């Protein structure tokens, strides 16, 4: 059908059909007469999986023979989404599978919709890990992702009476055809116990044992025949565990709970014992696997030449003391040699500066759960502080600030400080964020060891986020500049020579229009809701958080509503305002924001004077598969965090690649996006980081904005008096009180500039030709935001390995 | 190699090899260079499974089209053992698979040993269910086994310091290639709640819901291309279950515990709420499935013409009130019509008369868990007792005895009485047991409804228990009389014409000798123990229970030891005495018996004066796969329960088929075995049922036997004084005290006759020719004990269906 989806050769189509029928009969044990669409999805998934297998075996064989440096990417989260289509794209099988299924009387698009998301992350951090795995495979790196196979991923969100309800995401109910259990490589993980000191060093004894069973998932590179591995650990009780009899067997659940559920917090630290168990579980199993692989090739001097460990935030930070434990207690290396090896092996990526997101574990938890690790942490701290004292003699306050051990009512370990001490490289995830790290929270560490600190601006994979989700746009691009851009996204710059080409302008606008119609129909079918597809699609999708300022968007929506009601017979550019995202279950204010958004919709969408000039839709259950649908349909991307708070963002980049314009603050990667595209092709507004700092020094007083801006006062009076909640007039008083008296994110301070900037958006949308030309300028300069670029930088500047675009033999 | 294992044609061998390599590569994702023997086992299992699939689909299709009467066999236990070899035997693939694997450089016997037993039962009751499934498929019946897929089956037994230790049987750890999950046919099961009475009948409301997910396992018939289904239910929480957030997800375990573990009691009732949940779970899910299948063909008058439900003891007895609940509350049938349908549909098999084994559930448990069922039970009882009062007017004591509701400190429901009331047929499992039912515990019911009471003597499948475990014996039989006996075991009578044939005598003895050498080598390899394979192999394997009288065997072993020590230079026939079996974890006396057996071994096996004339071995972890090894090697089968206590026995029959002679009491099926073979060809001893009754009327006084039999007094003094436990002289005082003062099973009363009978065994063993002739007479008359005979009787006399030996097309 379309070129970028590959060839549908007669031999290949015939073979796919044979194998589909083979799997339906033998694997699924169904005949066509009772097969459901789910059976057909599974038969197709098994058919496509068979094509991965040979490449997977050959790739892993190739690494055993060549013995390259291995990259281990450790994360508590891998937000993978669906696998079927991505696998077909990466193996060039999409058109052949389409044809094969078409000839069997089936619609492949319908079958794709049956697959569950692998929702093993919360948002951006977990999705970054997934994009990175795709880029590492595409760049031929001998890379392994290591994590936890949660039985329950991020909860499914239902909206009932305008409120978020949570349901368990039982993603494994029907089976997962992509994984392979490897019960043969099961490893023990120790907890509790105590330390005894012999003449032959320390011994960690009387421990409870939980088994870590690995499940392997293939990670195909883009058309290079490389298939890497994502290894996820599941918790199993040993068979003598607790061994009246019946109760002992039922109590195996206590051990197996470690891998049961993903903690559903985004940018928030919850210091619970179960979470600490999860962190150690992943680290201890992974490190044993790493060392096993290293020994199958005494001399740990070469360990950093053969192994890189990348810590995805501090969540796997126990890798540092665990590596020391193994090297010192088990392999009998002297402390200094072990520390040298550890530092050269480990690197740390920071993803946030919000204080409530930083992991600070109570000493009493570590003392009970991991007594040997606590001793090792204390020794690291004493040796580290001795270096600080030698470099900055007499600076006693610096010793207190830099300590791994925080004093207070409860003594805590600062895991970020541990990661900096024990890593040869520390990076932020966008230029402004990496600068903030050096100037504020890690300033002291930067002064001691400036060479450690780097930037690696985030990216997204153009396979999933262009080719897979927006084939129409991929194709019209490919017609002009060929297919090479899919693995070399900088080639999109060539599109700048088509900015005045009438046919290209028309095609870009046509693809957007098609995507909007398709999404408007999706909404009607699955959610009984009717939207005008000629309206500007104004989209804010991301987790619900005060710092992301969904509330600022709400204030603009109410402003538009009030302006319409004031002058109903004036023309306004029609908008469909779509907001979606999950709130963490314990985050009360985030749950109230969801309720406000639905309550605004309840008023706006049923006011006959508004008509179809303004609609407000809350998009339920925002997740990777919904992102793939809504992002290609968007006109305007809302990226409106308070300057200094969004470390990078990656949704921002997805929208840029897919032909939306951006309204945003100079925060995270928005700064670099604006720089690449030109500030004239971006809708920038609001306080810069420096302006936020100036306000904080003077003191933020929200009342000043309320007193000076009549349109804002009207909105607050509407919220307070029960206009958006007639039956419960005080329902939103917590929101009003926060905005007026303890708003950490200065919503009112950016309100006037935001509304004015939104008026400029509407003015440009009225001139479709100029809107579309600006879009071309954004798509054309989005190349920097490929995760292939990001990963090549990690590879060269941190891991010390050279990427490769060369194909393994088929 | 041997004829009964089928053809190894070049085409078939080539195809099996191709498919083996296909599964190793694609299914297991291994290459030969890292494959372990476990990988090879799985590749073979998947290869053999592929041959079942077409037949399974066609069989189930055939039943949908023909719509025969369906037989539903409901059991809490299915003791299946291993599947690989049985599948090969039933599909005539054994020699081809042997050849295929041989050409790949692998030993198929070694691969078979890797498979885990499916240990989803305790002993005889669960194993009977498994034999029955094999016979139902072999006889072409449209039969379904329904049960629970326990995550943990019967515990693995380890012996430490002579004591039983229990370990969880994590049988699913490496996967089960035989099952197919069917998450699409998941059904809800209700618990707790309350009953409200509308004008439109009763409604069971406010219930907790647990989901029942089915897993299907194929059950191949013997060379007839029939493949029936065993459907096992697994418990799943619904996704809104308990829905802070983390705890709600972890608490899903409370619902899922229902299918977690098999209760490990044999012939003992433990009235725990979890067990009641298991019983209702299996019944409620199964009955919905039955009704669904019936409707896919208003008129419940035809229900008993299309459906038979066989209750395997009272464990699934809630089927009776559940069927009434569905018919009356949901389908709106009048009570009398529903009861007619229920009675005509259900039949009940009793497997024990021991009072501590009978299920008597406290009313307070049923009231809380199953309030509607309790109401229905009360209504059944009132209507039933009205019939009793009309038939036997004024007999008030009979009303009390026959009531379903037992009065007392705690009110209980007698589930056996419920089953009799609600079934059209009630059977025992051997002639003497069925007579005991009519004369003693069910006498009142027999007088009311004599037509209900039947006998169906138990049997064993000759596929598993001859062809599979003893190919050498199967072959030498087949050389004389052909292969037809494998599905028509009565043809073994033809062997009586070879009782004086010198070559047949030699071959029978040769096969036994080979089996003994093979078992003696197995013992050495796996358990570091050295036995004389020229000794008489004296074997007692079965669950440890006071009624089975392992203690009587112990008394004989000590008697032999003491006789040797008294006259060391006299010849005695050498014996290896082997005792094995599991004790229920809470059954203290059974655990003490195990310790006594090992303690006797500790003395006897290390006494240099004994030499290799007497060895006592405790066979660890007795289970189906160990039975398949030890039974073909046995010379003497110990079946020595107190008369009136072993309802049938089935181990007894396994030994008879495999060329052991039997020493036993006139109990259970031993009576019928002796009748078939001739009493002259059986070593019968001890009290008959009538003699036990006479002793009970006079009063059993164990002291009388102690005072009169010096050899017995010596043994008791050795036990009491610490001869078998020097470091803990009082270790066995509980055993001595029980034997002397509260022995319900009259061990001392059969001691003298048992020892004298054992002397006759030894005398015959000295004349190998006459021993072997007696063996031929036993094997030749074992035909009655085929489960094919048993199932044909159930089919004709209870279910109203005709068996068939006709083949479905291949
Ligand atoms: O002893 C060996 N001989 C040959 N290949 C090996 C051996 N050990 C590991 N491998 C290769 O590496 C394995 C990949 O798994 P890993 O050992 O977890 O990296 C297999 O797929 C083999 O291809
Ligand atoms: O609607 C139908 N059309 C054709 N065959 C059916 C239908 N429903 C059930 N079957 C057959 O019976 C099924 C066996 O599963 P069951 O329905 O659980 O007995 C399938 O394997 C089909 O062969
Ligand atoms: O760099 C990729 C993403 O990491 C996100 C981010 N997520 C988290 C986090 C997640 C879970 C948790 O328990 C604790 C913190 N920190 N930072 C950033 O907010 C986003 O700006 C960035 O693009
Ligand atoms: O008829 C086959 C077998 O059932 C055995 C038997 N097992 C049980 C039982 C099992 C588990 C349980 O929880 C409660 C009772 N009752 N009867 C008999 O003892 C045996 O003689 C018979 O051959
Ligand atoms: C990309 C993505 C995110 C991150 O979006 P931000 O706007 O950068 O917070 C979150 N959730 C999902 C499902 C995503 O695909
Ligand atoms: C046959 C069998 C039984 C029943 O044996 P009995 O001697 O009749 O109690 C118990 N366990 C296993 C493993 C069996 O194969």
PDB file of C-alpha atoms in Angstrom, chain A residues 22 25-31 33 39 49-51 53-54 56-57 61 151-155 165-170 172-174 180 182-186 211 213 236-240 243 245-246 249-250 252-253 256-257 260-264 270 274 585, chain B residues 22 25-31 33 39 49-51 53-54 56-57 61 151-155 165-170 172-174 180 182-186 211 213 236-240 243 245-246 249-250 252-253 256-257 260-264 270 274 585:
ATOM      1  CA  UNK A  22      -0.170 -23.347  11.704  1.00  0.00           C
ATOM      2  CA  UNK A  25      -4.255 -24.821  14.828  1.00  0.00           C
ATOM      3  CA  UNK A  26      -1.199 -25.993  16.812  1.00  0.00           C
ATOM      4  CA  UNK A  27      -0.360 -23.127  19.158  1.00  0.00           C
ATOM      5  CA  UNK A  28      -3.840 -21.854  19.951  1.00  0.00           C
ATOM      6  CA  UNK A  29      -5.768 -25.143  19.482  1.00  0.00           C
ATOM      7  CA  UNK A  30      -8.677 -23.449  17.660  1.00  0.00           C
ATOM      8  CA  UNK A  31     -10.316 -23.962  14.257  1.00  0.00           C
ATOM      9  CA  UNK A  33     -15.232 -21.809  13.200  1.00  0.00           C
ATOM     10  CA  UNK A  39      -7.261 -15.751  18.690  1.00  0.00           C
ATOM     11  CA  UNK A  49       7.664 -13.613  16.682  1.00  0.00           C
ATOM     12  CA  UNK A  50       9.025 -16.585  14.692  1.00  0.00           C
ATOM     13  CA  UNK A  51      10.878 -14.029  12.445  1.00  0.00           C
ATOM     14  CA  UNK A  53      13.954 -15.728  16.821  1.00  0.00           C
ATOM     15  CA  UNK A  54      16.735 -16.574  14.410  1.00  0.00           C
ATOM     16  CA  UNK A  56      17.846 -13.006  18.391  1.00  0.00           C
ATOM     17  CA  UNK A  57      19.866 -16.220  18.681  1.00  0.00           C
ATOM     18  CA  UNK A  61      25.880 -15.636  19.645  1.00  0.00           C
ATOM     19  CA  UNK A 151       2.401  -8.449  37.399  1.00  0.00           C
ATOM     20  CA  UNK A 152       0.378  -5.195  37.463  1.00  0.00           C
ATOM     21  CA  UNK A 153       1.627  -2.177  35.547  1.00  0.00           C
ATOM     22  CA  UNK A 154       0.310   1.370  35.708  1.00  0.00           C
ATOM     23  CA  UNK A 155      -3.381   1.238  36.729  1.00  0.00           C
ATOM     24  CA  UNK A 165     -11.164   5.559  39.709  1.00  0.00           C
ATOM     25  CA  UNK A 166      -8.259   3.068  39.527  1.00  0.00           C
ATOM     26  CA  UNK A 167      -8.457  -0.522  38.249  1.00  0.00           C
ATOM     27  CA  UNK A 168      -5.664  -3.095  38.270  1.00  0.00           C
ATOM     28  CA  UNK A 169      -3.882  -3.497  34.921  1.00  0.00           C
ATOM     29  CA  UNK A 170      -3.925  -7.264  34.644  1.00  0.00           C
ATOM     30  CA  UNK A 172      -0.705 -10.764  31.634  1.00  0.00           C
ATOM     31  CA  UNK A 173      -4.247 -12.258  31.840  1.00  0.00           C
ATOM     32  CA  UNK A 174      -4.291 -13.586  28.261  1.00  0.00           C
ATOM     33  CA  UNK A 180      10.492 -16.089  27.153  1.00  0.00           C
ATOM     34  CA  UNK A 182      14.205 -18.501  31.618  1.00  0.00           C
ATOM     35  CA  UNK A 183      13.665 -20.403  34.920  1.00  0.00           C
ATOM     36  CA  UNK A 184      17.077 -22.029  34.356  1.00  0.00           C
ATOM     37  CA  UNK A 185      18.911 -18.707  35.089  1.00  0.00           C
ATOM     38  CA  UNK A 186      17.095 -18.126  38.390  1.00  0.00           C
ATOM     39  CA  UNK A 211      14.537 -16.075  43.991  1.00  0.00           C
ATOM     40  CA  UNK A 213      13.482 -15.592  37.778  1.00  0.00           C
ATOM     41  CA  UNK A 236       9.682 -16.480  43.477  1.00  0.00           C
ATOM     42  CA  UNK A 237       9.756 -18.037  46.957  1.00  0.00           C
ATOM     43  CA  UNK A 238      12.203 -20.932  47.480  1.00  0.00           C
ATOM     44  CA  UNK A 239      10.450 -24.349  47.969  1.00  0.00           C
ATOM     45  CA  UNK A 240      11.500 -24.733  51.637  1.00  0.00           C
ATOM     46  CA  UNK A 243       8.856 -25.012  55.801  1.00  0.00           C
ATOM     47  CA  UNK A 245       1.674 -26.637  56.384  1.00  0.00           C
ATOM     48  CA  UNK A 246      -1.247 -24.913  54.542  1.00  0.00           C
ATOM     49  CA  UNK A 249       2.395 -22.445  51.477  1.00  0.00           C
ATOM     50  CA  UNK A 250      -0.033 -19.498  51.380  1.00  0.00           C
ATOM     51  CA  UNK A 252       4.845 -17.636  49.856  1.00  0.00           C
ATOM     52  CA  UNK A 253       2.935 -14.505  48.692  1.00  0.00           C
ATOM     53  CA  UNK A 256       6.370 -12.907  45.667  1.00  0.00           C
ATOM     54  CA  UNK A 257       4.799  -9.510  46.410  1.00  0.00           C
ATOM     55  CA  UNK A 260       3.556  -7.658  42.094  1.00  0.00           C
ATOM     56  CA  UNK A 261       2.910  -4.010  41.339  1.00  0.00           C
ATOM     57  CA  UNK A 262       4.462  -0.846  39.904  1.00  0.00           C
ATOM     58  CA  UNK A 263       4.475   2.132  42.291  1.00  0.00           C
ATOM     59  CA  UNK A 264       2.271   4.614  40.398  1.00  0.00           C
ATOM     60  CA  UNK A 270       7.278   7.386  48.674  1.00  0.00           C
ATOM     61  CA  UNK A 274       8.248  -2.652  49.601  1.00  0.00           C
ATOM     62  CA  UNK A 585      -3.748   7.501  43.577  1.00  0.00           C
TER      63      UNK A 585
ATOM     64  CA  UNK B  22      11.714 -26.651  14.963  1.00  0.00           C
ATOM     65  CA  UNK B  25      14.709 -23.232  17.786  1.00  0.00           C
ATOM     66  CA  UNK B  26      11.318 -21.464  17.627  1.00  0.00           C
ATOM     67  CA  UNK B  27       9.472 -22.537  20.768  1.00  0.00           C
ATOM     68  CA  UNK B  28      12.358 -22.751  23.215  1.00  0.00           C
ATOM     69  CA  UNK B  29      14.670 -20.144  21.596  1.00  0.00           C
ATOM     70  CA  UNK B  30      17.815 -22.260  22.129  1.00  0.00           C
ATOM     71  CA  UNK B  31      20.506 -23.621  19.797  1.00  0.00           C
ATOM     72  CA  UNK B  33      25.245 -25.460  21.815  1.00  0.00           C
ATOM     73  CA  UNK B  39      15.343 -28.074  26.862  1.00  0.00           C
ATOM     74  CA  UNK B  49       1.718 -32.531  21.775  1.00  0.00           C
ATOM     75  CA  UNK B  50       1.389 -31.399  18.134  1.00  0.00           C
ATOM     76  CA  UNK B  51       0.100 -34.959  17.310  1.00  0.00           C
ATOM     77  CA  UNK B  53      -4.023 -31.393  18.645  1.00  0.00           C
ATOM     78  CA  UNK B  54      -5.776 -32.381  15.449  1.00  0.00           C
ATOM     79  CA  UNK B  56      -8.477 -33.114  20.137  1.00  0.00           C
ATOM     80  CA  UNK B  57     -10.134 -30.549  17.864  1.00  0.00           C
ATOM     81  CA  UNK B  61     -16.164 -31.103  16.991  1.00  0.00           C
ATOM     82  CA  UNK B 151      -0.533 -24.300  42.042  1.00  0.00           C
ATOM     83  CA  UNK B 152       1.007 -26.694  44.606  1.00  0.00           C
ATOM     84  CA  UNK B 153       0.132 -30.376  44.490  1.00  0.00           C
ATOM     85  CA  UNK B 154       0.946 -33.028  47.068  1.00  0.00           C
ATOM     86  CA  UNK B 155       4.106 -31.947  48.949  1.00  0.00           C
ATOM     87  CA  UNK B 165      10.017 -32.933  56.174  1.00  0.00           C
ATOM     88  CA  UNK B 166       7.603 -31.318  53.675  1.00  0.00           C
ATOM     89  CA  UNK B 167       8.578 -29.113  50.717  1.00  0.00           C
ATOM     90  CA  UNK B 168       6.214 -27.304  48.360  1.00  0.00           C
ATOM     91  CA  UNK B 169       5.656 -29.083  45.033  1.00  0.00           C
ATOM     92  CA  UNK B 170       6.181 -26.177  42.679  1.00  0.00           C
ATOM     93  CA  UNK B 172       4.486 -25.397  37.369  1.00  0.00           C
ATOM     94  CA  UNK B 173       7.911 -23.692  37.806  1.00  0.00           C
ATOM     95  CA  UNK B 174       9.242 -24.660  34.362  1.00  0.00           C
ATOM     96  CA  UNK B 180      -4.050 -24.815  27.338  1.00  0.00           C
ATOM     97  CA  UNK B 182      -8.726 -20.685  28.128  1.00  0.00           C
ATOM     98  CA  UNK B 183      -9.080 -17.190  29.699  1.00  0.00           C
ATOM     99  CA  UNK B 184     -11.938 -16.550  27.245  1.00  0.00           C
ATOM    100  CA  UNK B 185     -14.249 -19.023  29.112  1.00  0.00           C
ATOM    101  CA  UNK B 186     -13.662 -17.412  32.517  1.00  0.00           C
ATOM    102  CA  UNK B 211     -13.272 -15.599  38.736  1.00  0.00           C
ATOM    103  CA  UNK B 213     -10.332 -19.442  34.670  1.00  0.00           C
ATOM    104  CA  UNK B 236      -8.496 -15.054  39.678  1.00  0.00           C
ATOM    105  CA  UNK B 237      -9.521 -11.802  41.385  1.00  0.00           C
ATOM    106  CA  UNK B 238     -11.687  -9.406  39.332  1.00  0.00           C
ATOM    107  CA  UNK B 239      -9.836  -6.165  38.306  1.00  0.00           C
ATOM    108  CA  UNK B 240     -11.963  -3.861  40.513  1.00  0.00           C
ATOM    109  CA  UNK B 243     -10.784  -0.970  44.342  1.00  0.00           C
ATOM    110  CA  UNK B 245      -4.042   1.440  46.159  1.00  0.00           C
ATOM    111  CA  UNK B 246      -0.883  -0.710  46.698  1.00  0.00           C
ATOM    112  CA  UNK B 249      -3.583  -4.856  44.632  1.00  0.00           C
ATOM    113  CA  UNK B 250      -1.577  -7.051  47.028  1.00  0.00           C
ATOM    114  CA  UNK B 252      -5.874  -9.950  45.379  1.00  0.00           C
ATOM    115  CA  UNK B 253      -4.030 -12.961  46.910  1.00  0.00           C
ATOM    116  CA  UNK B 256      -6.458 -16.355  44.442  1.00  0.00           C
ATOM    117  CA  UNK B 257      -5.576 -18.524  47.454  1.00  0.00           C
ATOM    118  CA  UNK B 260      -3.213 -22.372  45.662  1.00  0.00           C
ATOM    119  CA  UNK B 261      -2.746 -25.702  47.392  1.00  0.00           C
ATOM    120  CA  UNK B 262      -4.078 -29.259  47.625  1.00  0.00           C
ATOM    121  CA  UNK B 263      -5.170 -30.311  51.127  1.00  0.00           C
ATOM    122  CA  UNK B 264      -2.748 -33.183  51.831  1.00  0.00           C
ATOM    123  CA  UNK B 270     -10.412 -31.218  58.048  1.00  0.00           C
ATOM    124  CA  UNK B 274     -10.568 -22.631  52.681  1.00  0.00           C
ATOM    125  CA  UNK B 585       1.591 -33.074  57.817  1.00  0.00           C
TER     126      UNK B 585
END
